[PDB]
Design a protein around this ligand. Sequence first.
Ligand SMILES: [Zn+2]
Ligand SMILES: [Zn+2]
Ligand SMILES: [Zn+2]
Length: 1102
Amino acid sequence: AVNSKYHHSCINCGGLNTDERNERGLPCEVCLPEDSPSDIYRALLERKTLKEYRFYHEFWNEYEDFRSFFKKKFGKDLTGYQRLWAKRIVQGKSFTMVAPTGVGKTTFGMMTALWLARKGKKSALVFPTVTLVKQTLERLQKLADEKVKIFGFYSSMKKEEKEKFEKSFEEDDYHILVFSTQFVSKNREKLSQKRFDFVFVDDVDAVLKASRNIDTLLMMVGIPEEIIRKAFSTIKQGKIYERPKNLKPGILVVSSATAKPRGIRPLLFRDLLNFTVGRLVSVARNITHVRISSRSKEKLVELLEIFRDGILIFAQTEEEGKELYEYLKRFKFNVGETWSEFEKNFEDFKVGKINILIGVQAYYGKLTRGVDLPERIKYVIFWGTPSMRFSLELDKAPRFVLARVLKEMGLIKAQENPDVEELRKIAKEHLTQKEFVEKVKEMFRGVVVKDEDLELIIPDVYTYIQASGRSSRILNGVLVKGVSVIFEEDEEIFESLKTRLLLIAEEEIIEEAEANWKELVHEVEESRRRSERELTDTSRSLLIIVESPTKAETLSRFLGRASSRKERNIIVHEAVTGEGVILFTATRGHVYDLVTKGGIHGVEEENGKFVPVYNSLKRCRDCGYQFTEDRDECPVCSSKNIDDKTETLRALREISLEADEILVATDPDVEGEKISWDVTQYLLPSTRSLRRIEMHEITRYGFKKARESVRFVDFNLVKAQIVRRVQDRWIGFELSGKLQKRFGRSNLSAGRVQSTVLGWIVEREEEYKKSEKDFTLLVLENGVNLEVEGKIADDVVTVVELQEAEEEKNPLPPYTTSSALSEISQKLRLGVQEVMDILQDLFEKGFITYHRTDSTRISLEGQNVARTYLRKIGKEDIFMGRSWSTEGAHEAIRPVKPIDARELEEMIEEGLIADLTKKHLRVYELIFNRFLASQSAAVKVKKQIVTVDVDGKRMGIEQIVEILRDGWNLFVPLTVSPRFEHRTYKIKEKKFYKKHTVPLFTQASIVEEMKKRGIGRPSTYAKIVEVLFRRGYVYEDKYKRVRPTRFGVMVYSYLKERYEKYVTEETTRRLEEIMDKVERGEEDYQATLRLLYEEIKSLMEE
Ligand SMILES: [Zn+2]
Ligand SMILES: [Zn+2]
Ligand SMILES: [Zn+2]
């Protein structure tokens, strides 16, 4: 712990508790004075302070009973899925049953109904077919005791049972009633007027077949049609509705929606039961993609001879499908078809009568609405790459083509016009067909331009992912293996497909050389027969907490958002994986912050040591003002519409009860570690299993490598965070007051570093006017311009000495935060803050590595990315992998996937991935090129050193002329220059001036400088500059240089004259150094706090 207080963190009284206690899962000292109590419930009860902890006691107990019961009555222990479901059931919550292929939902429904009836609760079990009713009642009756009233109703019911069921359902206080969906639809009013505690729906689609059934099931727990209609109007509007707080409904549990949840009705579940009926989208895949270079039917024969059984062939059209069908029929392969005898051959393949199924992209994917058995399909063969093809003529041209062409050429800026209208608008301004197709082949990167027959081929990656996916799912708890083979000869098509497959599914496609058919086939078959065996289940449920919604979005993009429980302030998404369930949600910022109320500006002091005091953050959703103090309205605009992180915290504590294991996934810096602790400490009394993962990339790889590096919270980082926060708080408050009493305004000083930097700017203005040395620029004939000492007047430049030399130039190291901010904000007309934001969205959308790094280090994986990209662009002979550094916390800012900017633009305009402005693309382009340059070979250049005489003065100038050998200059342009000859160059024009030796600052220059002096950190740079701007201390001029204003000069003059100690560069650097030492556990937390306090105490007297 870090010895600090959190205002609502008591598990039992709901009030203030210390970090150190929550860490041990204890209630506050008020609730329980004892140091180390033996049993928490017992001790709370003894002292009569037992309040909310009861809830948890009763929870755990009432669960462990269930489990026990389940383990007794049934074979063995609960599976992870059923465990999560159980834990949700004792809370009385309603939900969808998201799970893979038949994990046993009916078993859980049965044992739930049994365990409930054991107390006295009445439940209902609904099934689509009338046979499932029979079977379920069968299985029920033999395991249920005499105390359980069991009835049934279906098609082939009797002549006195049909009425028996009705009278008993009318009066006789039943326990468990098993019936069809038909009965629900038919006897709506009868059920609607009855109240069930548990309702289990096996097939949601059958019951969602009618709109009345929604209101029926809703009225089967005790909800009037008034709330239903009100909620209906609200969902007809387009926003959310809220349930009356005075409602207690039963437990409705349903399975996953097969078809898309079409209609307006299901939204009533979102408001009355707080659960969304989702569909089962599983992205869990174990597929190996191999590519063969030639469409030779001999290769296909050999392959089929290896695979032998359960093969699925896909053809471009039906013509080549039939052709291949005939060729294989002749060669004595047991084969079937989809276009002629669909069902026959399909089910004959399902049984085993057929070894090879040949279909089309259009026939199979639209007629397989029947079954699609996964335990049979091992191999998928693609006879050509699935793709959409367009025509490249003046006519027959789509929208996006003419769009990307004209927008870049001349006609379009950013606009949308009717297609044929656009054709008729370019029908006059274009030149030729040749020039058109050339513009297409030059502009469009990432696709295939068949200029031969005038065609554009775009590989359909989605279709490939689906079709390939048909060979690998989860069966009997086992993620079985599958091989996907592609027969493609055109290198452009294959490369396109591979890039977009890496972009969406992050899956690699290998070559026939690096693939052993025997081994692969073996893995496939063996995993199959491993799934055939009797299952033992080790699936666990997992909760993952991150801080920003964007991370959660892109996480849901590769984990798959099946369903989403809305829990107070937050929206927890759930996904199915091969290792179990996986829940993830976003905090939306920080949770706790330093209080302003008491002590020394929030920091209290007891027993010689300092104790930080935090309270939950509140953000007005209207004006945007943030605060810590507990108020009902916004302290500024007096509005009640606020966001309260305490609600978020409570919600998290609620979710943490379902999950077996929890992982906090905040950014890998001090800030993130602080947040992670604020959360883990709060949750720790509730859940025993809490750990930390640091994701440097937001991709499947970043996540996997994060989980391999799981750990507990590092308290030195928390301590560091705290120390800096306290310095900014104390120094900021004191200096800001001292300025309140001098310049009127209230808030002015955010800290010490800010002031230091401002000093740099202010005094830079003074040492800029003194560097004013007179100069003169000379435009030369048959050459470039030349810069020489002022006041020249001979109009004749002579050449005296002239020599040349070859040199090998290494590239610049990869971007760090300072470097990135500087160069990117310089090359673009953007501020460092804008750049920083773009970087943040870039990392959080899983496109680059962590954007806050002070290391240039690069791993084998990064070098690997560079390597594969160079091998993709052909120039792989210029690859030179460089680690760049061994001393490194994280890597440098680099791309995560070998995809350049142009390809990204292509995928964006196409619609694969979205949400990237032009600026995002440009910044990414800079990062990418810098990284590859850093991974490219050294450029060998020839430069010359020309000594020229100008009016009695010898001046030498060195310039690059020839690039004798390429390297990294392909990504980062290396400027050449016209040669000087040993003659006499005459001056054309003399532009006299006096530009200063020591120039002014720019934002880039400032970041560079404070990096160069040891002031600030990667997370603070841009924020610092922006703050300087927002406080009016500084402005930008014509050529965008940073200049101090009146106010800034006044402020730094005052501060330097009076408080020179707390603004001096030496002091700031010494403090940065010492705190950075605290971060590494080298300097003492409490001691540096003592120091800061001791200088503050001195300041509070001036
Ligand atoms: Zn501790
Ligand atoms: Zn308490
Ligand atoms: Zn407000």
